[PDB]
Design a protein around this nucleic acid. Structure first.
Lengths: 394, 394
RNA sequence: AAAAAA
RNA sequence: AAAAAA
RNA sequence: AAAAAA
């Protein structure tokens, strides 16, 4: 009797939720100082020029990691008024020190912008940080730019034009997380399709299409360091918690997150869907109860975590390995074999892991092949229908 | 009636949890004085140079045990600011006396470093302790170094480079505990695979790959003395208790521990999994109730212990022998025979102990062979499915 | 960790 | 009092 | 004590 309870209690302790209490002291390593050019004034022309400069610089081959991630962050958190306040309210990681800096307009410089927190006299630093090398030597292809060469600059004065430009750029930057952490290289068609989709959504315009090289560089950078990913996830979590209405860009991001959610938990989501939601006879086998209770505990932990659960892999945190299939390889293989036949979109999904068992795969395949028209018992009793009508084509 | 209760009470006393009360006086033996060069200043170049020197010295054939373990500890607890405070908060063993010492930079010496606690005038001691003999005579192969000979030195100035180097080195040092205490020799492919895995995790780089000789020496040292293992476990326990966020290195370690957990309790974990979680008819036999209650008491003791339970074998403590299979050899053999067929990864797992019973092994094998498609009663009644569908392939 | 998802 | 028990 | 476990 009590054995089952003791066992469940024991299994629950293996996946104890590390909730915030206060224990464990407080450790933190060295944090860099990444510079983030935030536009001081709330104007439109200044923001447009800043974004143009950032894009023109972000696509440079010879660029430092810290500078690149700071540029990306500066690009991201720009639409809100006083981005400094938002960045401060969002930045809560000891990975790096977000060194803010105000920026204003200047009609006496190449880039046309200058830092206000440093001092009005400082102008050379702006030009040195915005434009130094753009493929002048070495690799001339290393520079990136929009696909349309006719657009030499993206500087605009009308509020609407700038708003749509910023929204399109943020969307192009955000859609990368769908596969940045997972299979970054094999994520070109997906992003292309998402862009082709948003374009005919009337929310953006295809004229502001960036070269594939720029996107690839950004994805690589996003994968390399996790400070940017942490900030992006915190921003998405904040936006999702917005009780009231949400601006155009806010809604764009809260929509794009759904592609980002579960970006690496496929082996768990699909597993649950094809081996729990399907209620197949195979689940009753003595060889599946362990995996079943494991997945139960896993999803309990997930729903107990909070709002940062789905993004667990995006933060490349430690708990992501707990949701791997290494603990339920059999059920995972069975579910994948089932999905290969039912979903019919999971053909290009690679799953050739070192703990794959083609036996259960073929098992689920054959079970699905034979059960093409086999009506269940629960639904049959609920509706009262006969199976004679279901096997008419099968 | 009361007999069962008296019996259970008696069995519970055989495995009384030795909790901290105050009784037993206080005994402690002689404790060595191992030197641990801790970098005084929180700079980056000094830490990188110190690590380079330690690695260059750690892979020496003619090196003293105490010096080697002190070097290892110095290497481990370096990422935190003021490692001295952490080492003091963690060091709680009477096995050895952790003799800390501050270190600073010095541009007037071979190694370029000097001790600050001893005195600024002391410089020769630094060179004598960092570099004396590196295979100059005797065995020239005895020296170790990274696999890439082009890397003559790992000294870097950029914070990111040093951080990743330190993280990779700590990961290489930590992954050894997975099999250091248990089958250290047969732990090369596992570590190689873990490294190949972390590399494509974008968290480390393969360029900082160390020779197999260095890893083998470190594993041997870690096995020889238990002060290092005690410190490592205390560090892991501390990190796991961190309520707040965890740095990159902290997360790396809290992930790597999962390979370290249960490193020697396989005969218990697998036993529970294959003879309790599986709910086979064999468990109802009169010849298994004793083992069942034994394992119940064992896991009760485990869950009552605390956070240092799984690492019980890593500390080579006395309680590890209580969880051995010597008290439940039958159930252990049955479970191993079952796992040999179900898991299908437990082929290379050696279990040829002096209390093996091939009878129950063949028994569980045959039971699993015959029960390849035999649906249980509990799950069948919960779902209501018939067994006709389960024996379609079997 | 690997597909799809106005 | 009589074996085994990392 | 002995395997596997993004």
């Amino acid at each position: 009797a009590t054995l089952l309870r003791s066992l469940a209690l024991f299994k629950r302790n293996k996946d104890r939720t590390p909730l915030t209490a206060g224990s464990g002291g407080a450790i933190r390593g060295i944090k860099h100082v990444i510079v983030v050019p935030v536009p001081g004034d709330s104007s439109i022309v200044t923001r447009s020029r800043l974004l143009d400069r950032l894009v023109r610089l972000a696509g440079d081959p010879y660029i430092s990691g810290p500078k690149l991630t700071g540029v990306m962050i500066s690009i991201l958190s720009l639409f809100v008024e006083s981005p400094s306040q938002l960045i401060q309210r969002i930045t809560d990681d000891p990975d790096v020190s977000i060194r803010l800096v105000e920026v204003i307009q200047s009609e006496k410089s190449l880039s046309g912008l200058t830092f206000a927190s440093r001092g009005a006299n400082m102008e050379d630093e702006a030009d040195d940080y915005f434009s130094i090398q753009a493929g002048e030597e070495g690799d001339t292809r290393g520079t990136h730019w929009f696909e349309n060469k006719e657009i030499v600059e993206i500087e605009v004065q009308d509020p609407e034009e700038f708003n749509i430009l910023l929204a399109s750029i943020l969307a192009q930057i955000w859609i990368l997380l769908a596969k940045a952490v997972t299979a970054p290289d094999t994520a070109a068609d997906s992003e292309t399709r998402r862009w082709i989709k948003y374009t005919q959504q009337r929310r953006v315009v295809g004229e502001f299409r960036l070269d594939k090289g720029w996107l690839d560089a950004v994805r690589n950078r996003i994968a390399e360091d996790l400070s940017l990913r942490r900030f992006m996830v915190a921003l998405i979590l904040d936006i999702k918690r917005t009780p009231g209405n949400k601006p155009r860009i806010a809604e764009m991001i809260c929509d794009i997150d759904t592609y980002i959610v579960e970006a690496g938990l496929a082996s768990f989501i699909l597993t649950i869907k094809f081996g729990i939601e399907t209620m197949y006879p195979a689940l009753g086998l003595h060889e599946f109860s362990g995996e079943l209770t494991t997945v139960e505990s896993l999803m309990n932990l997930y729903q107990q975590m909070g709002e940062t659960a789905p993004y667990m892999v995006i933060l490349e945190n430690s708990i992501q390995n707990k949701f791997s299939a290494g603990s339920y390889p059999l059920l995972w293989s069975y579910a994948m074999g089932v999905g290969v036949e039912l979903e019919n979109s999971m053909g290009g999904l690679n799953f050739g892991r070192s703990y794959f068992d083609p036996a259960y795969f073929r098992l689920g395949q054959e079970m699905v092949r034979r059960s093409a028209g086999k009506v269940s018992s629960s639904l049959a009793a609920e509706l009262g229908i006969t199976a004679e009508d279901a096997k008419l084509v099968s």
